[PDB]
């Protein structure tokens, strides 16, 4: 199905069409908290907000805001939290809410800068000397290792709650060469990067949701978590033909906001996960080629 209406939308050229339609049928839900005064300055723009409904809640009797949604996937049994990459401000919140919500990995989409401006804070160390203190939510992050490929980096951070002395490891998976508003190289070297995040665990049902963000935490992130969710839900029932792509996003957007957000972002959408249907009904040479495919070395 999902194959013959890629062919059939590739052959009338109407991408756009099919994408401007998923946004006009999409939820809308009152962003109440996200838009109140007070936190102007926690949201990095002014037209993305989390939904009151599905918003992370900081523990805290100050302020419990963050610009972050947690898509909780019901018939996949998957979630993730979804968040705008954050401000000089904002950084301990993140971490705080990767405290409070027991994740394990940190999926970032985006560099630090883009176009020439600032699309994230450098909220995590760069140099396992030079840790980092958020004092405002008592918390220590140290840089522990980094594994540098080509155009993706895995780095092993150590998470301290500062208040009870308790730490965890957090993985952080940065995908480098993922341009704004853009798709990236490969089918193939995307899968690399996504079998990457699965086959750290971080994705187990065992943990919190994986954090997903790059700038927005709507565009680039939204295409990461539809090609997954298609993915794994494919795999549950070992039935490529069950899935239908668009009612899948459309469930998403109940979640957050303005999901993928370009036509080609839905097209390669689809590419990535009629390429990685392979892997799931059981061609074991695929994840192989996506690696060489993939050019990380
Ligand atoms: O590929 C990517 O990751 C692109 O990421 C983005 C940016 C970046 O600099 O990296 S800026 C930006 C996005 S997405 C986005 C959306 C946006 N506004 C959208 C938000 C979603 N809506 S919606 O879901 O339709 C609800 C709505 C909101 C506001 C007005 C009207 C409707 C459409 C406008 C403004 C800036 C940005």
Redesign the pocket.
């Known amino acids: 199905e999902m194959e013959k209406e890629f062919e059939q939308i590739d052959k009338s050229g109407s991408w756009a069409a099919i994408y401007q339609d998923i ?1 006009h049928e ?1 939820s ?1 839900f009152p962003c109440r908290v996200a838009k109140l005064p007070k936190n102007k300055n926690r949201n ?6 989390p939904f009151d409904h599905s918003r992370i809640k900081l523990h805290q009797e100050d302020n419990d805001y963050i610009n972050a949604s947690l898509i909780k996937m019901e018939e996949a049994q998957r979630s993730y939290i979804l968040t705008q ?1 954050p401000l000089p401000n904002t950084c301990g919140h993140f971490w705080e809410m990767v405290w409070e919500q027991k994740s394990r990995g940190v999926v970032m ?2 560099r630090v800068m ?2 020439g ?1 600032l ?1 994230c804070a450098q909220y995590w160390p760069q140099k396992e000397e030079k840790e980092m203190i958020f004092e405002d939510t008592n918390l220590k992050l140290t840089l522990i290792s980094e594994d540098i490929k080509s155009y993706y980096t895995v780095r092993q951070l150590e998470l301290e709650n500062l208040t009870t002395q308790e730490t965890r490891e957090i993985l952080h998976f940065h995908y480098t060469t ?5 798709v990236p190289e490969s089918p193939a070297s995307f899968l690399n990067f996504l079998f990457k995040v699965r086959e750290s665990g971080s994705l187990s049902p065992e943990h919190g949701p994986v954090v997903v963000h ?10 990461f978590c539809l090609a997954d969710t298609c993915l794994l839900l494919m795999d549950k029932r070992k039935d490529p033909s069950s899935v239908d792509i668009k009612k899948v996003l459309l469930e998403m ?1 109940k979640f957050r ?3 993928i ?2 036509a080609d ?1 839905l097209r390669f959408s689809y590419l990535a996960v009629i390429e990685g249907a392979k892997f799931i009904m059981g061609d074991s040479s695929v994840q192989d080629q996506w690696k060489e495919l993939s050019h990380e070395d």
């Not at 993922?178 to 853009?182: A, N, R, S, T, V």
């Not at 790059?214 to 295409?223: F, V």
């Open positions: 946004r999409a809308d990095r723009y002014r037209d993305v907000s990459g989409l985006n883009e176009k401006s699309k993922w341009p704004d508003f853009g790059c700038s927005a935490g709507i565009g680039r992130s939204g295409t957007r906001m303005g999901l957000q370009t972002q």
